[PDB]
Amino acid sequence: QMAFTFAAPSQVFYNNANIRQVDVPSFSGSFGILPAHVATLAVLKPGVVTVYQEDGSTKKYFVSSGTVTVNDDSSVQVLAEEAVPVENLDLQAARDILSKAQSDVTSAGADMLKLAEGQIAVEVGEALVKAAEG
Amino acid sequence: MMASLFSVFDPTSSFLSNWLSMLIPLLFMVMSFWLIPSRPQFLAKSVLMGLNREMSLLMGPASFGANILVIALFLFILFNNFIGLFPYIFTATSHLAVTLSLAVPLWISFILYTWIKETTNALAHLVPLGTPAPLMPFMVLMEIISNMIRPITLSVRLAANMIAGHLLLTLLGAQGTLENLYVTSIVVFSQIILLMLEFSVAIIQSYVFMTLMTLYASE
Amino acid sequence: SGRRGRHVDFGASVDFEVHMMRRALKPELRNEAIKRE
Amino acid sequence: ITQSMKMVSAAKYTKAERELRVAKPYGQGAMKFYEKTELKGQLIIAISSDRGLCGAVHSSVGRQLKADLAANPDTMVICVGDKIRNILQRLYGNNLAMVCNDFGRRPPVFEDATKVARAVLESGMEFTNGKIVYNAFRSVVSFRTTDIPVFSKNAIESADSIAAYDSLDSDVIQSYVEYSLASLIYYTMKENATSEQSSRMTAMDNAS
Amino acid sequence: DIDSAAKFIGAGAATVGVAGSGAGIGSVFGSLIIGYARNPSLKQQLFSYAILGFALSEAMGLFCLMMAFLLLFAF
Amino acid sequence: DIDSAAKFIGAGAATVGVAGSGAGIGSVFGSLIIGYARNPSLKQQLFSYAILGFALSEAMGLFCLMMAFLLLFAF
Amino acid sequence: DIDSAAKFIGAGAATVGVAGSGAGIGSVFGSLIIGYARNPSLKQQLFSYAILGFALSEAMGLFCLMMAFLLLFAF
Amino acid sequence: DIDSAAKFIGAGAATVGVAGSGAGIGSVFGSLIIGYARNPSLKQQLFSYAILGFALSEAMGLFCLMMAFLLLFAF
Amino acid sequence: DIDSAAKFIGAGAATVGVAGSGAGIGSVFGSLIIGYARNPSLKQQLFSYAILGFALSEAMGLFCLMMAFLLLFAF
Amino acid sequence: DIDSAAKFIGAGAATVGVAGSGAGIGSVFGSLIIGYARNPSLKQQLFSYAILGFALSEAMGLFCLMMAFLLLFAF
Amino acid sequence: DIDSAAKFIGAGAATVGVAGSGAGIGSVFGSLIIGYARNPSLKQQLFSYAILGFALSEAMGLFCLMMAFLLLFAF
Amino acid sequence: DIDSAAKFIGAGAATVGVAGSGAGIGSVFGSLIIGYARNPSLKQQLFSYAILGFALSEAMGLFCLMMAFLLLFAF
Amino acid sequence: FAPPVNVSPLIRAGRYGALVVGIVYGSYRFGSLQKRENEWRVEEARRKVIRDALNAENKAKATREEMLYLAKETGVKVPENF
Amino acid sequence: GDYPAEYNPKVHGPYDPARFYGKADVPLGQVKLGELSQWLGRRNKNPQAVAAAVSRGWWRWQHKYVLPRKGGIAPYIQLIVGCSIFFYAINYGKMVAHRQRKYH
Amino acid sequence: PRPLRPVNPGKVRVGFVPEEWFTFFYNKTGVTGPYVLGAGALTFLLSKEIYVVEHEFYTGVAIAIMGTYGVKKFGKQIADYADKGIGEIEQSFKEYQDSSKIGFEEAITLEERAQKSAEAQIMLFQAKRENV
Amino acid sequence: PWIMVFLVSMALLWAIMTMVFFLYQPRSVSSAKGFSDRTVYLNWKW
Amino acid sequence: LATFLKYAKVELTPPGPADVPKIQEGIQNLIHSAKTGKWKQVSVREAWLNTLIVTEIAMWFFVGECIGKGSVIGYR
Amino acid sequence: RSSIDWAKMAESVPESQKAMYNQFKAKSDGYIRVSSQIDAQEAEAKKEITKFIQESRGRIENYKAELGKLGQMIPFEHMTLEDFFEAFPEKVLNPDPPSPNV
């Protein structure tokens, strides 16, 4: 009885579809969403949003960012920013982005802004490296 | 490790008895003369105004004008705890008349005001909300005993924290020598740490008594 | 985290996350995944 | 040239209505949180393009802005489009903070909505309520002008209906607003970029 | 004369049992703090639940105190 | 008359298990405050489970009090 | 006779070990409240694990009670 | 003889119960820190409820201390 | 006849320590409830950590029980 | 001669009540860690709250240390 | 035989620090479960902190066990 | 002899605050795990606070052990 | 401070007279009370040894009576020596 | 608790409680010691008079150490040390009973 | 004569002792006079066991070390915080009398221009007689 | 002497209450702002 | 601490071997006055200064007694 | 060959407070292209002008008295609470309303 909406700004995967379970890696810690979940709004962090569909088949999707919104009528709206599945990921590009981010962190020095962006890209690189190995 | 000492609460030390050890807040009273205040007067005014602004949400309509009495109680506790910890001034709260006058009559006034004005509130505050019929009598008896002994517990606590602090300070001082600089320095350092702990405990105790007084006046 | 602490809002964090997420689609999908602006 | 530009806008209608097959549920699912909290309310956002010969669409936006000026005159307006700034300059140049330019000649993406949201929230102006007036898309031959009510961090923190929403603190609500506000703007941009072209194709057809 | 002595020791040992009631009262009021920081609009219900929990824990502590005062006098 | 003294000491020392009942009661009702603050629409099931937890904690405390009264009046 | 007397004292001391079992029951059911407040559709698995926690702390309580009975009689 | 000896033993036993007071006050102020991590605008009411819980836990512990002193001197 | 008496008293005092094992198992499995409430799809590792934590706390309780039996039938 | 002996046993029992102070200090500083994880910009205020709780927990411990030293070399 | 009897009593009453060690190990592993449910991407660091906390808790228990053995045998 | 025997009993009864030390240390490091799961970029400050809490709980345990040794060789 | 002027020779003369008289008086009193403390310490040690032996015998009898009372109360066996 | 009967603001001025508005008396530090007994008998010895003199001296101390603008911690340290000295003079019976030396 | 408020309090030596107690001895024994007197009085009170070094003396030392540390650390912060508020009260007070004098002079021109209407009222009826 | 201690503590509390009641800084804010809003003018005859 | 030592160098010198008539003249001036007058003709401040000077002089007796007995705090 | 001083007549009124001049300004514009009543009104207005002048003189004297009171007041630097309660008679007295911060 869950109305799940997974909608990237370029692809719409689920449009108020009926979904058994939604796992979402957020800044509030990774949590699993079931029907009649609590109303809670969460801010997405990079990682695999794995969807347990009602037919018994589970499809995993990465998210770059976004927001998770659980509603009191048992309806979720995960509005990602980039989302393509774990099926299409290139491990070497993730490792190259991670190495570039670490180089930017080491060469930032006193630049607090470049250090912050390097830390963000380090988080995304670790998440992509972890996700592409499945 | 060697021994200790006691018998410091004597009220008959000399002809000029220890009742002058309670008037020392009058020396530390801030007496104001000029229009533009002095530094201690302005600091005291800032402290009291901050306390009034913090306790404004707990006053209530019944004791709107009684905040001055609560602030005087706070200053009374603070001066009897801070100046009571100085080494040659005896613990006034060791004799329980001070804590009796500090705690008991305001509770008697509040419980009489409750019993006269709102008897329904007096009979309903004992019974917890949502309590069924077979869970009544033990709750009634336990709450009656606890509420009839609660100001006594507050007074004995406000005496006993200072009693424990002064006993531990005297025990640390008595176990300190003079010929050994290491042992004396360790004793002095431990008394510094214990005195910081006792000063913080005294301030927190005065604050919690003020907050309890304001919240009970709100009732 | 360290994002907001360095006077960086969530829009810039979103932009960096989405750029690094688009860039991990080399052999077929970096061309058809980014419309640029 | 009006008949010749009729099929030019059809290519820019087929690349703005087909592009609305996935930009529409992204905006419906964004407002579903606002559909449940049900808050009532400043901030005014105008959506247009930097191109002329648009008929009366920008005239309709200016008419709606003139109507909005009679309700909350203390509003600082941030517009997507230089034409609305040029129209409203003579009216309220004292209350023009910034207007985002370079829009309309290319189909919108999310980066534009993110930049407009950052321009809105990084100005330091104090706002609680708000709305984003956009020319919604109903049909090819005619459309409807509506708006989406926008809200700030303190508007949803002090809401009576947010108490059912848990696992919240200052950082989560702050970080939720500056992506939801960047998602509603993307819904207003993608609907407006169809209405500003589908109603221009017939304005080129009316002279054809 | 060992009977009165053991009544004294049993009274003290029974009065040990109020410790868990003090700990439970601390737990219920600390969770009143952490349950009032989240959803402050339910203050009346949360304080009612705090009063009920404190009353039950105090009932346990005074049962221990009653078993201290019962051995000491009536047993 | 040593054994009566022993029974008094055993009763007083067996009445310390009520501290655990007090602590468990405080824990379960503070967590009732917590779990009612978040998602307050489930007050029926929250209060049902909290009364169950209180019943079992009070059962442990009454088991300890029963063991005290048996150590004093049965053996 | 002092052997049976110290048996009584030993059972009185062993009955304190049920306080932790009571506190464990209180903790497991209070966290059942907290865990049912968030995502309540897992009620059956949550209650099965809460019953498992109740059983595994009642095991410690019954161990302490059996030690008290064994010191009183079997030892 | 052994009456005053057991007065000392019973007082030393009965003053254990302030351990629960210390644990309860620690739990109160720890959860005050947690409840001030989120929503710092409720500082006055958080401090009020924390002071309430501290006072009640200290009341239970000082009830243990009061019973210890009553066992020591007045009997 | 006083040495076996003290063995009974010491064993009864030693078996208090299983209370801490009971409270530890209670906190472990209450945490299992809370941490399975969110992330239901992690139960194969949450339950393994719960099994390990229960095994360690119950192992400390069994070591305390072995200390109790060493004061009675080994020393 | 048994009076000083029971003073030793009473002080040994009286020093147990510092255990609750230790547990309270641990809870205060652990919750300081948890509260510093969320909104770490409140570092000074949360450390002030931690010191405020720690002082009261150690005051509860000093109550039992005072009762240990009153039995030992003062009564 | 009196002094060895009191050695037995002290060794039995000193091995109840294993209670607090069990409570600490339970808290460590339970909060390991709670903190692995939320953000499982730090599993090795979370388990290393759990090993550190369990080691220090068992160290505090082994201190009391060492005092229990060295009261009965050495000092 | 009865004075040295009671010193043994007092030392054994004094070696109980190590339980509170162990419970506090376990709470500190479990909350370190929890508060490192959320906002893991603060490993240094979180571990500093865990070290501070562990040090103060160890200080309480060492105060109890120092009283245990002073009740056996000095007092 | 202010520049110093020499003290008029009554404070200095009386000061050093008291200083030297204090030195010699302290030496004489220290010697006399050292002899007095030696003899007082010797006689106090003698009477303290006598009193300590008497109190040790009295306390041994008191501990014997206490152990007999403890045996009669607790019901334990009464040893032939205690 | 009002102004003393020797003070009239039309003649004297604003009220300084540390002032004596009565008869212009010989200062205490200039009595030639031959008339010092008559000087001590000149002052009234009622409790009202000694309380007025004590409050005058106390307000002179306030005017020298507290009521100035840049008042420091020196008056309060002075009060603390004076109170410790006076209460040691009170508790001298208890202090002399314990001591450290036995002959001295 | 009216009392005057000095900026600085009485001169204090050795932290709390009045300076006048030292300068009293300058006509007899200069500078080291009062210090020699204080040292001799301290050695006399210690030597005769009038000033008993008991357990309280090891608390007054611990009070004085913390008392010196607090004054030598927070002394300038608290004094500057307090003296800031004294000026702000004067800043509140100097915004009263200065504004009242200028405000009264503004109120004079309100009364002066009310006379100017009466000055121009005469020409009003000399301006309506031209239309006839 | 407990009644004497009660009376001494009560008198000290009354003195502290009177001290706190009188411990305030009076400020003068009755400036000439109200006089500027009294621009009384004479009307004209037509 | 240096300036205090310079002041002590100036104002703590023992009386010299050449000013004995001057010190004895002052002693007999005090003796001849106090038995005839000049003590009921001295102001309270001046007499208080004289008594405090006498007390400070007398303190050197106790300081030299502590020198001449070893331990300062009493005898041993 | 007739005209009036329009500048002083316009500057005399406070514009909107005496806007009936502006209606008269619109009337008198068209006339560009009962005398005994005006003389009687001149006499009445002269009497009212004298009354308003003496009232304005009284108000000016009161304002001068207030300024002299402010000038004769001692400064707020070397002033006491007694001098403040003398110069400002608001005071805190026994028959006063009770307030926490009086």
Numbering used by the authors:
A (entry chain H): 15 to 148
B (entry chain N): 1 to 219
C (entry chain I): 11 to 47
D (entry chain G): 19 to 59, 66 to 232
E (entry chain 7), F (entry chain 6), G (entry chain 5), H (entry chain 8), I (entry chain 4), J (entry chain 1), ...: 1 to 75
M (entry chain T): 3 to 84
N (entry chain R): 3 to 106
O (entry chain K): 1 to 132
Cite, word for word, the article reporting this structure:
ATP synthase is a unique molecular engine that uses the rotation of its subunits to perform the catalytic reaction of ATP synthesis and hydrolysis. Unlike in mammals, mitochondria of the crustacean Artemia franciscana have the ability to accumulate large amounts of Ca2+ without undergoing the mPT. Here, we performed structural and functional analysis of A. franciscana ATP synthase to study the molecular mechanism of mPTP inhibition in this organism. We found that the channel formed by the A. franciscana ATP synthase dwells predominantly in its inactive state and is insensitive to Ca2+, in contrast to porcine heart ATP synthase.
The local refined map for FO at state 1 had a resolution of 3.3 Å. The FO domain of A. franciscana has the same subunit composition and overall structure as the mammalian ATP synthases. It consists of the c8-ring and a-subunit (subunit 6 or ATP6) that form the proton translocation pathway, as well as subunits 6.8PL, subunit 8 (ATP8), e, f, and g. Two native cardiolipin molecules (CDL1 and CDL2) were found in the A. franciscana FO domain between subunits a, b, f, and g. CDL1 is located between the subunits a, b, and f, interacting with the α-helical domains aH3, aH6, cH1, bH3, and fH4. The second cardiolipin molecule, CDL2, was found between the subunits b, f, and g and interacts with the helical domains fH1, fH3, fH4, bH1, bH2, and gH3. Furthermore, a stronger density of the e-subunit C-terminus was observed in the A. franciscana maps in contrast to mammalian structures. In addition, the C-terminus of the A. franciscana e-subunit has a different conformation; it is more curved and extends towards the c-ring lumen compared with the ovine ATP synthase. The distances are suggestive of the following interactions between subunit e and the c-ring: Salt bridges between eK61 and cD1 residues, and eK79 and cD1, and a hydrogen bond between eY71 and cD1 may form in A. franciscana FO. The residues eK79 and eY71 may also interact with the c-ring lipids.
